[PDB]
């Protein structure tokens, strides 16, 4: 924590580069983490992969990209807001650009010999005592600008969060209560699918280990899992493909379908052999 | 912990060697540990051993090597990032290379008698009081460069982690949900195989000790292990060989196979006698 503490290099053309790096790089890392952790980017990638023909129209891809970027940008925005409200980065970056002519609150004692160097050295307390008033005059100005920018950022972000939702409810063909039900269903489906995938994988692995050694060393909960849930085989690759991708609220016979797993279960999702272990049986014969 | 504390030798052509050693050697050790602990390097070695003919193509070997190196390089990268953000190693290494002409923030009081020696002696507080400003001028510069490099490293690493995953999902023939299921299966298979190997070895050892002494002194849990899981013999060497190596998602009759243990259990993996205890029975007769 003390490692990432801000340390302004008081040098012209050098402090703003350090501020830019030390502020943007954490923001970029948070943006990357937000992109990676989201599962909507991955099924968007899966759609672009399996479609392989640019079949999807511009509107749905644009909507998904906007949603992913908006969900990811929460952490960079709040990090930037905190950094701006702190004021250290902005004063460090903009100390060297302060105009000596515009300086006030003291008689004109500011030298013009090396103006940029002294202005850049202000943050590190390396201010001559004869310019003790000027240093504070700049410190209260640049920090003010920093905090002003932070507050404007919070205002703009709040306005965007208000407007985006006000348009999302207005342009959606569904009611907001039905969309809340849909969100609840999506959360429950994701959690249940993950849990059952874990259990199914454990049971299959136990069967394989039993085939190898002749028995399996299982715990009591694992024994209950094996007894209650028996597995006969593995789901085919097309069955997995039928449930991976983006879904936009299709309706069948007046009844809503809330995911492509639901659509597949209803039966609305389901010659050439690929990535086979061995050749056709005719070739195996020879 | 205090043993590995950094101690800069303030001497020209000597401090950067110490910094290089004291930074790289921990990084090299962490890289070696990451390589060793991973089990993918070992089944890659097993493949190169049993194939013994360079049979594997360049693409799969390159992919496995890239994966192993990428997984191993996490600890060296974060260690280097922390060391760079600390700034001590970089300032110690680059103190002697600071150009006296480029020095500023003070009148030209820097001697040219032995410039390199004083510059190298800056880190150890052995700076003459007449150069007290120069020492700080260098301390805020070199440390800035160190921290800048650290932040650039974090940015590049984050970009690579984003791009590599974005390509891994794009070029993979499987969907991301199926790959998650595959990873869960691999973890469960590894844990179950280790546990059953331990239990099987314990039961076999108990049988041998019973053959020697006439009984075995077993604990209650060991008694349960012996009663529940009886062993009749040991698996042959080819049976072990059939499950050790690298596996790349073959598919049999439209059904996925997730490991070579699974492939062996399905029956798709299975004259000259090697490393025998005694000669052929014909030779034993004589």
């Amino acid at each position: 924590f003390s490692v990432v503490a801000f340390h302004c290099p008081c040098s012209p053309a050098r402090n703003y580069l350090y501020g830019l790096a030390a502020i943007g790089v954490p923001a970029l890392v948070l943006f990357i983490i937000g992109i990676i952790l989201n599962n909507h980017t991955w099924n968007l990638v899966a759609e672009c992969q399996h479609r392989r023909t640019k079949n999807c129209s511009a509107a749905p891809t644009f909507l998904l990209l906007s949603s992913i970027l908006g969900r990811a940008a929460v952490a960079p925005v709040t990090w930037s807001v905190i950094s701006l409200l702190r004021g250290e980065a902005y004063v460090c970056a903009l100390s060297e650009f302060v105009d000596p002519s515009s300086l006030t609150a003291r008689e004109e004692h500011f030298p013009s010999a090396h103006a940029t160097e002294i202005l850049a050295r202000f943050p590190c307390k390396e201010n001559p005592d004869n310019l003790s008033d000027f240093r504070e005059e700049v410190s209260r100005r640049l920090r003010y600008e920093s905090q002003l920018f932070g507050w404007l950022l919070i205002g703009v972000v709040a306005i965007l969060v208000f407007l985006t939702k006000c348009l999302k409810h207005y342009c959606s063909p569904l009611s907001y209560r039905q969309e809340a039900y849909w969100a609840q269903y999506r959360a429950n489906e994701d959690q249940l699918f993950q849990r059952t995938a874990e259990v199914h994988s454990r049971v299959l692995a136990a069967n394989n280990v039993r085939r190898f050694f002749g028995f399996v060393a299982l715990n009591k909960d694992d024994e209950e899992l094996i007894a209650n849930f028996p597995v006969e085989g593995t789901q085919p690759r097309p069955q997995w493909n039928a449930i991976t991708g983006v879904y936009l609220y299709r309706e069948n016979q007046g009844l809503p379908l809330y995911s492509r797993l639901h659509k597949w279960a209803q039966g609305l999702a389901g010659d050439n052999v690929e990535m086979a272990l061995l050749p056709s049986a005719l070739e195996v014969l020879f | 912990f205090s043993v590995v504390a950094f101690h800069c030798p303030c001497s020209p052509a000597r401090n950067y060697l110490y910094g290089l050693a004291a930074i790289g050697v921990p990084a090299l050790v962490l890289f070696i540990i990451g390589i060793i602990l991973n089990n993918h390097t070992w089944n890659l070695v097993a493949e190169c051993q049993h194939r013994r003919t360079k049979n594997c193509s360049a693409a799969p070997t390159f992919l496995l090597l890239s994966s192993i190196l990428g997984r191993a390089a996490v600890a060296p990268v974060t260690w280097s990032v922390i060391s760079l953000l600390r700034g001590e190693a970089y300032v110690c290494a680059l103190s002697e290379f600071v150009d006296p002409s480029s020095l500023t923030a003070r009148e030209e009081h820097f001697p040219s008698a032995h410039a390199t020696e004083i510059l190298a002696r800056f880190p150890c507080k052995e700076n003459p009081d007449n150069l007290s400003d120069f020492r700080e001028e260098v301390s805020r510069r070199l440390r800035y460069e160190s921290q800048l490099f650290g932040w650039l490293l974090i940015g590049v690493v984050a970009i690579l982690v984003f791009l590599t995953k974005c390509l891994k999902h794009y070029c993979s023939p499987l969907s991301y949900r199926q790959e998650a299921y595959w990873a869960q299966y691999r973890a469960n298979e590894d844990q179950l195989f280790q546990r059953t190997a331990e239990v099987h070895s314990r039961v076999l050892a108990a049988n041998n000790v019973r053959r020697f002494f006439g009984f075995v002194a077993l604990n209650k849990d060991d008694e349960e292990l012996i009663a529940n899981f009886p062993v009749e013999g040991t698996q042959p060497r080819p049976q072990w060989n059939a499950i050790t190596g690298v596996y790349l998602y073959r598919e049999n009759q439209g059904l996925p196979l997730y490991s070579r243990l699974h492939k062996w259990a399905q029956g798709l993996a299975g004259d000259n006698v090697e490393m025998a205890l005694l000669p052929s029975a014909l030779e034993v007769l004589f």
């Epitope: 050439n272 990535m275 050749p279 056709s280 | -």
Partner: nanobody, 125 residues
Framework: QVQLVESGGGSVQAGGSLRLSCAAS????????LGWFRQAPGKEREGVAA????????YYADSVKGRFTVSLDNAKNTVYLQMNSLKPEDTALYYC???????????????????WGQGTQVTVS
């Protein structure tokens, strides 16, 4: 794209002769694997015979050598099989299968195309 029509099934006692035909319709240019398979309840599916259009050679199973034969009509693009010296062990479902080579890339595996057709052949005694 390619369909196989199989015919000739029936009930013949032991020692009889049967001629089963399989006609291919579609893109038969790329097919290099022509053969027949038999499967019975309670057991898996095995191949009686197959032939090579590309190379010319042929394989018969151990139970097929000297008993049953398979011929190909290139002009008709059809497969004919002659069951001679029928036995009660031949009561099984019979299929004719076609495969178009198969190219192995090391990273992904074997890829090809395969076709099938459902038929039966049961011997009373």
């Amino acid at each position: 794209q390619v369909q196989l029509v199989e015919s000739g099934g029936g009930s013949v006692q032991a020692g009889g002769s049967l001629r089963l035909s399989c006609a291919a319709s579609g893109n038969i240019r790329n097919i290099s694997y022509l053969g027949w398979f038999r499967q019975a309840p309670g057991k898996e599916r095995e191949g009686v015979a197959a032939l090579w259009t590309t190379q010319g050679q042929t394989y018969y199973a151990d139970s097929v050598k000297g008993r049953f034969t398979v011929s190909l009509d290139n002009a008709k693009n059809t497969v004919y099989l002659q069951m001679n010296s029928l036995k009660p062990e031949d009561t099984a479902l019979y299929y004719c299968a076609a495969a178009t080579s198969g190219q192995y890339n090391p990273l992904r595996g074997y890829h090809y195309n395969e076709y099938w057709g459902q038929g039966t052949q049961v011997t009373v005694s």
